[PDB]
Amino acid sequence: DRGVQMLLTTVGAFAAFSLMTIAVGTDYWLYSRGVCKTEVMTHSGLWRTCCLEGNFKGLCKQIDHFPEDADYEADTAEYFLRAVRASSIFPILSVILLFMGGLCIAASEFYKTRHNIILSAGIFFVSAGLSNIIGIIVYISANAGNSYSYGWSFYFGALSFIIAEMVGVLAVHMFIDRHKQLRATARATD
Amino acid sequence: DRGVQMLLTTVGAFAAFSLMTIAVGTDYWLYSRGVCKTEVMTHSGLWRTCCLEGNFKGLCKQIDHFPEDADYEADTAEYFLRAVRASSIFPILSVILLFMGGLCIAASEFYKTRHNIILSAGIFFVSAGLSNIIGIIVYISANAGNSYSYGWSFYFGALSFIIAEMVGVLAVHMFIDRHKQLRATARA
Amino acid sequence: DRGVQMLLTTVGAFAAFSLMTIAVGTDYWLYSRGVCKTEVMTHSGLWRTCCLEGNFKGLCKQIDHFPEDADYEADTAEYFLRAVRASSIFPILSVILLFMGGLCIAASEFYKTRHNIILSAGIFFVSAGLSNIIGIIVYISANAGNSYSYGWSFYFGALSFIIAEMVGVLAVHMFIDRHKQLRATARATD
Amino acid sequence: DRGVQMLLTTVGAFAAFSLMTIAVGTDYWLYSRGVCKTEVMTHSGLWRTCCLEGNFKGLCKQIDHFPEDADYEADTAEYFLRAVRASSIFPILSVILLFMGGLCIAASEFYKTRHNIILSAGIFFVSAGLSNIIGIIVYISANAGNSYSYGWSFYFGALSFIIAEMVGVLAVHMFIDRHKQLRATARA
Amino acid sequence: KPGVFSFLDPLAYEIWMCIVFAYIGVSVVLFLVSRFSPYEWHTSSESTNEFGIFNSLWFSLGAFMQQGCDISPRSLSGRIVGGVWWFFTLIIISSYTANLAAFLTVTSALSLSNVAGVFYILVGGLGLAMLVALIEFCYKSRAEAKRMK
Amino acid sequence: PQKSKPGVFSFLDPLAYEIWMCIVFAYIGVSVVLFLVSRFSPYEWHSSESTNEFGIFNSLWFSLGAFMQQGCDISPRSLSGRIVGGVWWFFTLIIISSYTANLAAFLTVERMVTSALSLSNVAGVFYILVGGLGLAMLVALIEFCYKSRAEAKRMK
Amino acid sequence: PQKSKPGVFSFLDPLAYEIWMCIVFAYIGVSVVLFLVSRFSPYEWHSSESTNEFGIFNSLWFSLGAFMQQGCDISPRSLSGRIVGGVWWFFTLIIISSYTANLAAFLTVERMVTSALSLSNVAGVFYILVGGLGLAMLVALIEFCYKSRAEAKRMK
Amino acid sequence: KPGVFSFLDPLAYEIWMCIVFAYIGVSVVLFLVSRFSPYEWHTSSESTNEFGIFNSLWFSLGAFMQQGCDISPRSLSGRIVGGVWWFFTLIIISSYTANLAAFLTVTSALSLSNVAGVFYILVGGLGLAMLVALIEFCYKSRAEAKRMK
Numbered sequence A, C: 001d002r003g004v005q006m007l008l009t010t011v012g013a014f015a016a017f018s019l020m021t022i023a024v025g026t027d028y029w030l031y032s033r034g035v036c037k038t039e040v041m042t043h044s045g046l047w048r049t050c051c052l053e054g055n056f057k058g059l060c061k062q063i064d065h066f067p068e069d070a071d072y073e074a075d076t077a078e079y080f081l082r083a084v085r086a087s088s089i090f091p092i093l094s095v096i097l098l099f100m101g102g103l104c105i106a107a108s109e110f111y112k113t114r115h116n117i118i119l120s121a122g123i124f125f126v127s128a129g130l131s132n133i134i135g136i137i138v139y140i141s142a143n144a145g146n147s148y149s150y151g152w153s154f155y156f157g158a159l160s161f162i163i164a165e166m167v168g169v170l171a172v173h174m175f176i177d178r179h180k181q182l183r184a185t186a187r188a189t190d
Numbered sequence B, D: 001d002r003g004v005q006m007l008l009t010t011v012g013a014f015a016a017f018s019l020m021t022i023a024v025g026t027d028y029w030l031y032s033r034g035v036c037k038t039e040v041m042t043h044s045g046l047w048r049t050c051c052l053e054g055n056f057k058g059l060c061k062q063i064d065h066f067p068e069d070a071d072y073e074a075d076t077a078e079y080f081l082r083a084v085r086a087s088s089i090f091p092i093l094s095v096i097l098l099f100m101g102g103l104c105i106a107a108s109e110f111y112k113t114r115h116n117i118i119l120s121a122g123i124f125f126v127s128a129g130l131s132n133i134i135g136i137i138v139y140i141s142a143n144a145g146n147s148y149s150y151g152w153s154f155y156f157g158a159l160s161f162i163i164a165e166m167v168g169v170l171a172v173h174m175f176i177d178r179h180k181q182l183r184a185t186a187r188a
Numbered sequence E, H: 001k002p003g004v005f006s007f008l009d010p011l012a013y014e015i016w017m018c019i020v021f022a023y024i025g026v027s028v029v030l031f032l033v034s035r036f037s038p039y040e041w042h043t044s045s046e047s048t049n050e051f052g053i054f055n056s057l058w059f060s061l062g063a064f065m066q067q068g069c070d071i072s073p074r075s076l077s078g079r080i081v082g083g084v085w086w087f088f089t090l091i092i093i094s095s096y097t098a099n100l101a102a103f104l105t106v107t108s109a110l111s112l113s114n115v116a117g118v119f120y121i122l123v124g125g126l127g128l129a130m131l132v133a134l135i136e137f138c139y140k141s142r143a144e145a146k147r148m149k
Numbered sequence F, G: 001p002q003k004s005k006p007g008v009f010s011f012l013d014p015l016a017y018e019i020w021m022c023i024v025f026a027y028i029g030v031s032v033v034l035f036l037v038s039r040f041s042p043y044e045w046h047s048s049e050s051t052n053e054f055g056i057f058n059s060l061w062f063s064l065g066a067f068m069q070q071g072c073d074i075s076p077r078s079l080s081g082r083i084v085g086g087v088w089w090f091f092t093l094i095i096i097s098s099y100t101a102n103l104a105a106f107l108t109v110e111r112m113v114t115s116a117l118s119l120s121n122v123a124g125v126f127y128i129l130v131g132g133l134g135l136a137m138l139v140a141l142i143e144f145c146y147k148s149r150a151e152a153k154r155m156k
């Protein structure tokens, strides 16, 4: 079943990484009323907003992450939230951590003797899920700061978080199984 | 006592089935003010409403489950609630589950070796109680769609739920005891 | 410590009975503004109200437990509360139960072999405390149904409840000790 | 390590005593708006208020603990709170308890056989922390009698409370270990 | 004019009745899913859990009463029952508290006349418990006496 | 004529004094009845110990925990004990909900004789807490001292 | 144009849908992290069993109990597990207080499309409960059936 | 404009600071009254209770958080500490909930922006916990290194 567990871990890691990468790259995060010219229904992601339907359909414009005049930067929380949202540092960090976990899984497959690689993969997947959570919260909060809906990229990211957490649990289970087998073999040989 | 427990289970099953059957078929679920022709003290059940006083006493009229005069249609969820109330699907399901639990009790009575029949009877009675709960909630919620009181058919249904739950507990206890005896025989 | 426990039980039983009897008999339950003629400061108990100070000091009048006109005998809770308050059935029942517990203790002193008398005394004292609680609640509720204070008879009743509960605990402890000694003697002799 | 634990306890005791002593004697408990003669940004301590800016900068005036101009006396409870605040009885008691706990710590160096001295030091430090808490609450409540902020003298007292509690925990641990060793030697 | 049981006002009478019915149903279902299977019994044999019908009723009451108990379901079906009962309890108790705050804010101190009903219920429950304990003790004493003969 | 701030013990304001007295009496009565129904019967006893842990001190502790919405490490197992526990739980639910409905509003009533709660408004809560701590310390110390003396009497 | 009564799922009204989604995600993440910090280290392991009972299923159960203001039969003992539990407890306190502040008012909002709460206003709470019961029954039955089949495979 | 930590608004900053101080003091006093006496230790010897400083802090946090824990004080002084902490927790948490209900009704659904701060704290705590665990693991692993040479 260990082989089945490894296959599930690899498939889930790849699926979560692909879903997160597609969610970050694509721009179907939010359907809302707005203007894509640089008010009609538009779909927007982390970087671009594009009109759908109408006569200007297909035109995309970069999202203005630092809007409004007079640039009221007296406070720090608003500027920090705007900067974090503009960089999208947490979704990209989740993507990077998912890639690192997949790399750790592959390296452990190559080695099959250093159990700490499995633990590192599990830690990477759990941290990727946490980064996904933080990025989702930051994105929604920045959207708050007029009927809207969430697109399939947003739910791709949510499913990526779910799958990353499941794969992290599986990797921790494999690490525990490896150490238990090592202890049992040590007991048997002595 | 296995015989006493079986007798109590059978008596409770019959009593709960009779109480739910009477509650479903009688017209004393609620007392309110209304008309039994085409405002006066009236008693209603699941299907018909009958006037209690006045000149039109004793005349029963079928309940308008989908009125088109003071409501003229409504939302989809409200229509679904009205359909569930009109069919009385959950009280009737409770009656059917109580009947099937009683038949399971009888089948186990003439099938001593089959222990899973006791378990089936217990499951049927517990599910009958749950269906009783759902039917009660559906009926009360549909009535919400200014003085009213519940009649003895409603409380007959409530008592049927209580007795069905107790009989389910007794049946599960009998099943547990039967498997205890089986494992004791296996050990010895 | 058995003799000390019995002495404490007897002293507490007598004290609680005396305090409850004084509280029920005396009329310093409530100081409030009112009229003792059949508005000045008056003191009232469970049966009588008497003016203090002024020129009509010392005159006592029986409390009107069924006041108001038109005799609105429509509901049942108000009439029941008024009747229970007028009879003072619960303070008197607490007095009777305290007397019964003291009698049980005295009877158990003569016998010293029937342990169920100690248990009966403990049950009587606990029930007397419960009756005291119910009577206090009924009295306060009927008073509710304009600045007032509670007199020393009220606090005599409260202290009677406290002492009755303590004596009930002591009596249950003595019953437990007697049964434990019986079991230990049975084990030793067999 | 017994020596390391004793060194940490001594260092923490001295640090907490110094922090509370500085907090009691300094005049940077609060920053507010007031007058240091007989409205301007100013800093206040337990005893004196000094103007921070303006023409009257650098002039300290004793705090009017019982004002009779804009308050014209108060209730008994308010007077008691004002007296407790004016005496600074609880911060000073915390200082005294920290000092006495430090002396208890030092006393055991030449009284290594006496274990109750460590327990006394721990009790003194814990009580000093509790007195710190009471003094902080009294000071804040008396200040309630529209902008302000607390200065480093206030947070010096807060840190003194934290360190006193930690040193009390360490002293109790040392006492427990000493009695552990005593019972181990008694066993063997 | 609020009665002695005006503390039940924030919820309708149908809500209280259905709360009782739901409590009974949840207790029965918890006991059933905990004890019906012979595979939960180890070798009279003993169960792998303590969730008999009486203990199931106690656990359900404790969960609804914001108190808890000394046992907790461990199987999947038992934990499903417990979690759904927890959700029901959270919603219902929160609704009762919010509606009770609304009812009370119609700041004057609460009078004893508004809680006399709950005091009466408490004392009646204490008396009932004492009666039950006394009957159990008397039955056991009679059993011992007839055994000694 | 300045507005009178709530007192140091203003946390008792939401309930009348009679309610507090009856709460204390009900707590005592429930603890006593729980101990009685848990410990009186010799058939609950096995040197010899009880089948349950509900002595008078433990019953008082359990009742206090139930009223404080906290719980403890023990729970009644018998029918009579569970009746006491359940009725006390219902009483606690009703009383605590009624008390905590408007507690913050009761803590800031300025009297002639939305804002954040201030420390003053809850200062009395802290004092009692610290008092309790001090009391407990004293009690612990006394016990230790007592035992020490006894050990001396055992060492001679 | 009659006023629209709250839906069956009106108990979700006090919080936005995004809050509910983030609550589910936070619950999953906290359970996973608690299991990880409780079970990953071989030094927490003694056939061989762990020093603690915080497997993934038990971690999910503990997290659900903490969020439901209920508790369970286990509690984290290690530093990291207690950090997880304490931060989840703080989150639960904040979120549950915010949700239950105005729940009854949210359950009776008549919309354009003090009174006792009616059964209809909480009917959706009951249905789910019964649904859960049914689901649990099904699950239990399935397990039994499965085991029965396995027993037959053992009997051959 | 409420910030990300607007859920702390119902209580003043001094109240939060004194809550932290009181929590520390209660935990320390509970540990002291539970463990200082050699008469509470039985024969390294073991204590009659599990109320070390770490477990005392855990018990105090659980009591304040409306969650509880797996241990409860049994001595008189420990139960005095626990009961007074229970009283403090009841008053303070009830006050916070009442003032938060007042603050939130200044019925519109709560937005994620109003609570996002608490989410941040949660995630931060999780990260911290993981870090701690990893650190501990490393400290054992390197130890095993010097245990394998």
Ligand SMILES: [Cl-]
Pocket: A025, A026, A027, A044, A045, A046, A047, A048, A049
């Ligand atoms: Cl984009």
Ligand SMILES: [Cl-]
Pocket: C025, C026, C027, C044, C045, C046, C047, C048, C049
């Ligand atoms: Cl009189």
